[PDB]
Amino acid sequence: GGSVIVIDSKAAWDAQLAKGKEEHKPIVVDFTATWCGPSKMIAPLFETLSNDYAGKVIFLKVDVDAVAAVAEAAGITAMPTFHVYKDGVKADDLVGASQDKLKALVAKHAA
């Protein structure tokens, strides 16, 4: 899926956040579920932005079915939910399938 990194475990989740802190590059995470309509509708844009901003922003995907513990720790309630992580901690979020809002989120934290 474009440049998006599929997170398959808590261990991979921690390592990616640790690398993003090392490299001083922001991380945008898409918390998804295959039963969620809005999640499937904005996934193509998340993939496109992952290609456009490759080198500036790290893009992760967390399926709440595959890694329930990471979704629980993140406090997810609705989907799609986007989280921005800087230096290991959550710095921003965006809930909903708004296309303009997602483009603005990635642009805000890539500058």
Numbering used by the authors: 1 to 111
Sentences reproduced from the published study:
Indeed, they reduce disulfide bonds on numerous proteins involved in several processes, including antioxidant defense mechanisms, photosynthetic carbon metabolism, and protein folding. In addition, TRXs have been suggested to control two additional Cys-based post-translational modifications, namely S-glutathionylation and S-nitrosylation, by catalyzing the reduction of glutathione-mixed disulfides (–SSGs) and S-nitrosothiols (–SNOs), respectively. The redox activity of TRXs relies on the presence of two Cys residues in the conserved Trp-Cys-(Gly/Pro)-Pro-Cys (WC(G/P)PC) active site motif.
Following the formation of the TRX-target complex, the C-terminal active site Cys (CysC) of TRX performs a second nucleophilic attack on the TRX-target mixed-disulfide, yielding a reduced target and oxidized TRX. Whereas the role of the conserved Lys residue is still unclear, the Asp residue was suggested to be involved in the deprotonation of active site CysC in both E. coli TRX and Chlamydomonas reinhardtii (CrTRXh1).
